[PDB]
C-alpha cells in the first residue's frame, strides 16, 4: 500500500543528491517515479552513507538499470570506493521511452524492489540500513517525483 506515501521532491535536476528525512526502518518505502529517455544507456538509484564525493561515499544499495542489448539491472554495494560482488537481474521491466514507478521496501534483512506494481528483485543488506542517510540518482533518467513512507 502507498497510502502513507509522502512525495516531497518533484522534477529534480539529475544528478540528484538529497538527505533522506528519516531512518530507514523495516516497512519504510522509497518511491521514485520517472521516465527513461530514448538515448539512455543506464541510470542508478544509490542509497548512500553520506554525500561525500572525495572520497566517494559508501553506497549501501546501488540499483542500476542498464539498457544495452537485452537489458538488465545490476545491484551492488560500494565500500571504500570499491565495488563488491554484483547481483545481476536479467528480468528487467525498464524500457527506453517508458515511464516507471520504483518502490523500494526496506525489510529487516534485505530490500525488496517492485517496479510498475510487480516484484522485481531482492537485495540482502551489506551495510546496516541505519547507516543510510542519502539518496542519489544519477545517469540518463528523468525523475518526476521522489517520496517516502516511514
Ligand atoms: O557493480 C556495479 C558497478 O559496475 C561497474 O562496472 C563494472 C561492470 O558491471 C563489470 O561487468 C565489469 O567487469 O567491471 C566494471 C567495473 O567494476 C560500473 O562502472 C559502476 O558504475 C557500477 O555500476
Ligand atoms: Na557508479
Ligand atoms: Zn513520464
Bound molecules: a molecule of 2 linked components (BGC-GAL), sodium ion, zinc ion
What's the multimeric state? Answer: monomer
Structural class given helices, strands, pairing? mainly beta
Structural domain count: 1
Distance between the termini: 12 Å
Counting DSSP E segments of at least 2 residues, the number of strands comes to 13
The Rg value, from CA coordinates, equals 14 Å
Main sheet, how many strands, which sense, barrel?
7 strands, antiparallel
So, CATH architecture? Answer: Sandwich
Give the proportion of residues in helices: under 10%
Strand content: over 45%
The helix tally amounts to 0
- CATH hierarchy class name: Mainly Beta
Looking at the structure, what is the overall shape? globular
Q: Find the CATH topology.
A: Jelly Rolls
Order of helices and strands: EEEEEEEEEEEEE
Site (Critical for binding to sialylated and sulfated oligosaccharides): 56
Binding site for a carbohydrate: 66, 76, 86
Main location: cytoplasm
Subcellular location: Cytoplasmic vesicle; Cytoplasm, Cytosol
What does this structure look like?
The structure is a monomer. This protein has no helices and 13 strands. By secondary structure, the protein is mainly beta. It has a single domain, classed as Jelly Rolls. Strands 2, 4, 5, 6, 7, 8 and 12 form a 7-stranded antiparallel sheet that branches. A 6-stranded antiparallel sheet has the order 1-13-3-9-10-11, with no helix packed on it. It is globular, with a radius of gyration of 14 Å. The two termini are 12 Å apart.
